[PDB]
Design a protein around this nucleic acid. Structure first.
Length: 145
DNA sequence: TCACCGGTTC
DNA sequence: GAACCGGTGA
């Protein structure tokens, strides 16, 4: 029932995902890491996603916090956008460093709202959008490798 | 039961 | 500061 991200050798990572419309936004949803080994390749899978997006000519994305808790308590889609600007930038650093910047923003959320000081888990359920892309074929290529 | 993220371990 | 564990409330 869940799709997965595949590594550069075509091996399936422990990283559940799905492609579709959620809260009016079309994109890739990467499921959360935890407990234990549930989706433990979150970070590697997300590194590949960023790298492959860049190789496909995508320089900017929009990333929403999409955990059941945050969706429940933060009704505003604009507030659920993890980064302060309109877009998040995928170029100018290594895919790893870009991920660190991206996932640092997840630390500003709690169960019920935003925080002052970022803390806690950074590997939560997120929705990545590429502006102008409404196609599962594109996203299929990105997660397949 | 399950995905949630707080909080400890790296 | 980031990776990971596992306790938690629904």
């Amino acid at each position: 029932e869940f799709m997965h991200v595949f590594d550069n050798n075509g091996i399936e990572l422990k990283a559940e995902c799905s492609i579709g419309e959620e809260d009016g936004v079309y994109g890739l949803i990467l499921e959360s890491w935890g407990p234990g080994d549930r989706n433990k390749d979150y970070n590697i899978a997300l590194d590949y996603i960023i790298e492959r997006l860049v190789d496909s000519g995508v320089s900017q994305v929009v990333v929403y916090l999409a955990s059941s808790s945050v969706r429940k308590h933060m009704h505003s889609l604009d507030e659920r956008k993890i980064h302060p600007g309109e877009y998040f930038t995928l170029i100018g650093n290594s895919p790893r460093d870009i991920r660190l910047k991206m996932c640092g923003y997840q630390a500003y959320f709690s169960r019920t709202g935003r925080k002052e000081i970022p803390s806690g888990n950074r590997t939560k359920r997120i929705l990545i959008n590429v502006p102008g892309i409404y196609s599962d074929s594109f996203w299929a290529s990105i997660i397949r490798g």
